């Protein structure tokens, strides 16, 4: 298939490589297999599943709400490019140091992850403003992706350093994401809405926590997983991080909207001691408009 | 210098290239010159100037205010990498399609540009919140950089399409940036503060507008400019977009702070008809707390 040189001869007892002078770049490292047919087959099935589910999610959202639509749109464009050019440059970058870097994946993260975090910063959909903490979440997450991409493009100690820089940015992201989910839990009404927020937190930390594990295991790290193997793992946590998380987030916004139509927007101030934070909780009746504090 | 193959022999009347089987990648396209010694010399001088000015800006900011510090820090790290590894992968990506892509530049844009726009969304430094429009500015600017980077990595019609996708994201960014500067102008006190905001708008639109022009002229476009030539142009608009803009922005925040200490925080509602928008203007005396409308 390749649009780099794939035909060569070994000469002088394997010490010389001769290639056609046809303008193409050449490197042995680029011709290593991407994995077994079973790994490839598994990857093509999960991709169709993700494309189908993203199209179902899109039509379903088509009946504010813009973050779920933007991510599902990017996911669709991603699949059409994978289907036609998955291993064509620059969906995969084949670089002079011999690396294969899945630019398609990192570009998708730069497009979708900040939007997931904007959604996280307004889980109820009622806020018209965003605090200073939202800005730190976005700046830390962009840095994480930039350091991780740089680590994947590098080798040796340069890779290790940029990976560690990504991990420090990532920890700052996780820490601040955790505070938002804690605020969200004490903001939404007392019943089912707190089940969904709890569900979204589990999906978020498990799926986002898997990305650094898949990096270390993949060709970008210790080469335990092949390229197809890494694709299979990444589409699974894509389904959790994007499709399932967005579905719950959409459901949560529907429940908040139904609550406000039936009961109106009645708030109670709750205080969170763990640091001193203030949150305006939604309640069901006017017997609550007080100043409560919940110790963690 | 290179850590790709630079030694080869032409055989069979220039129709065959033979190289050592030493594990290195090889491509003729990678060995094209980066430019003249004069272009290189010009580029090394402007880089020292930018590193020195970024260090002066850092010490000066060292006497909220975090956006100027974050950008000046990234600029410093950028210079230490340029000084030691400017043309080493992956500061430059040498890819299988023959392209040289200055990943160092695009990674810096992903780190600094969103932070410049967060600063723009709070020019006075008094806001504790950010509106919905801030989020569209950040999401549009990230997309611009992602499409532009993808265009630089591509060739032929693929490059043209991703460039046009960047231009559409970019126009949305410029349009929304223009509204913010219009709001900022009618928000800050009537004298010198409105001169600085006007100055920051000119710096912003001229320096940001030059990036797509330098893309079209550089190796990523029609190859009018060489690599050193493109570096020289980019450090100039870096000085305008980052160093000079941040300096004015810091100065503006100092003037707003002095105004509020001497006069207190007294606001007047002004309305902007061009769409109907509301802005809380800072004034000097209590004879103003009314509802004015300024027709554009
Ligand atoms: C050609 O190079 C090959 C390298 O594979 C040489 O073959 C090996 O020679 C070494 C001796 O240093 C043995 O230890 C290996 O068992 C050999 N075979 C293999 C498969 O590695 C070979 O000797 C060289 N021929 C000449 C004429 O120099
Ligand atoms: C070797 O290839 C070269 C290609 O440069 C041939 O040289 C040219 O031959 C063409 C004829 O098709 C002329 O139009 C050019 O003027 C020649 N010189 C140059 C500098 O381009 C050469 O003929 C080939 N030799 C053999 C034995 O096939
Ligand atoms: C907060 C999220 C929770 C999850 C946290 C997960 C922790 C994983 C840490 C591993 C550090 C080990 C260093 C990893 C460096 C990877 C780079 C690499 O593989 O280097 C290649 C090597 O130089 C040649 O084979
Ligand atoms: C809003 C900001 C104001 C400034 C706006 C600036 C307008 C520049 C537009 C040019 C379009 C022309 C198409 C550009 C495509 C570039 C890709 C290219 O050079 O293609 C290489 C070619 O395929 C092989 O040589
Ligand atoms: C999960 C993906 C669907 C199930 C696996 C499909 C597949 O590729 O099966 C190959 C077969 O098991 C050969 O070993
Ligand atoms: C979102 C990011 C996109 C990744 C880039 C995907 C771009 C795929 C380009 C396909 C390609 O290589 O084009 C060659 C051409 O079709 C034959 O001449
Ligand atoms: C660990 C690296 C530092 C994390 C990257 C920098 C985070 C951005 C930052 O400092 O933002 C603070 C802002 O005030 C939020 O409220
Ligand atoms: C905290 C204060 C700011 C300094 C932080 C990191 C310096 C290292 C930057 C990373 C450069 C790596 C390049 C390389 O290893 O070459
Ligand atoms: C602007 C950079 C400083 C002035 C140009 C320095 C330089 O490189 O001059 C080369 C000389 O002009 C040879 O033609
Ligand atoms: C901010 C983005 C960084 C760009 C990446 C710059 C990283 C420069 C790495 C230098 C390199 O190529 O390292 C080789 C090594 O020093 C010899 O074995
Ligand atoms: C032209 C491409 C579309 C621009 C990229 C999408 C912008 C993001 C968006 O739609 O954000 C709207 C948000 O509500 C802001 O207030
Ligand atoms: C507006 C509604 C959304 C569709 C927008 C763009 C489709 C084209 C996506 C870009 C794919 C380019 C890849 C290529 O050219 O191959
Ligand atoms: C839809 C795709 C998602 C949510 C992707 C998320 C990606 C990350 C959270 C990446 C995390 C990384 C680290 C924490 C450090 C090492 C480098 C990364 C980029 C793999
Ligand atoms: C400090 C560096 C700055 C402010 C860089 C800004 C970069 C841009 C505004 C890039 C703009 C582009 C377009 C509008 C479309 C084509 C692709 C880009 C990325 C060159």
Residue numbers in the entry:
A (entry chain A), B (entry chain A): 49 to 111, 118 to 328, 331 to 352
Task: Provide the publication's sentences verbatim.
C1C2 yielded high-density microcrystals that diffracted XFEL to about 2.3 Å at SACLA. The dark state structure of C1C2 determined at SACLA is almost the same as the previous structure solved by the synchrotron analysis, including the chromophore retinal, the interhelical interactions of the inner and central gates, and the extracellular water access channel in the dark state. (c) The structure of dark state C1C2 determined by serial femtosecond crystallography. A water accessible cavity is illustrated, with the putative ion pathway indicated by an arrow. The five glutamic acid residues lining the ion pore (E1–5) and the two counterion residues (Ci1 and Ci2) are indicated by sticks, and the three constriction sites, the inner, central, and outer gates, are enclosed in boxes. TM7 contributes essentially to the ‘central gate’, in which Asn297 forms hydrogen bond interactions with Ser102 (TM1) and Glu129 (TM2). The intracellular end of TM3 shapes the ‘inner-gate’, in which His173 forms ionic interactions with Arg307 in TM7 and Glu121 and Glu122 in TM2. The inner gate formed by Glu121, Glu122, His173, and Arg307 prevents water influx in the initial dark-adapted state. The crystal packing of C1C2 shows minimal packing interactions, as compared to the CrChR2 crystal packing.
